């Protein structure tokens, strides 16, 4: 029926929006991981200087 189709269509829409937000979280994680690489390397350099 139309009511069943709309309910599934809305539930799928809610899921698809949650997945786009997760995709963004992943990108942000990739970013933080890179910044940490950099700060860890900085720390490594400084420990090595003494």
């Amino acid at each position: 029926s139309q009511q069943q189709i709309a309910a599934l269509s809305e539930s799928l829409q809610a899921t698809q929006q949650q997945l786009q937000a997760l995709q963004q979280q992943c990108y942000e994680l990739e970013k933080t991981n890179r910044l940490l690489v950099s700060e860890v390397m900085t720390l490594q350099k400084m420990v090595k200087a003494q």
Copy 2:
């Protein structure tokens, strides 16, 4: 009709559950990264202050 819609509804319920697990996984990585950033910045300060 209904039984196809039911099938898809049930399939979506599975995808939505996997999606919750992934959200939780990313939350745990975000937490870890907060801890690492805090640590690394403190340790940098410590080494510099020697």
Copy 3:
């Protein structure tokens, strides 16, 4: 209608495929995280012994 049903089925399958992609991305982000955790632990020891 059957066309609405087929359209939802395709949409669901697309969402599921993307979710799988994200899952595998998250597996790589976890591995990187693990590396960083190890490296930071190592530095933490050293700095404490400085």
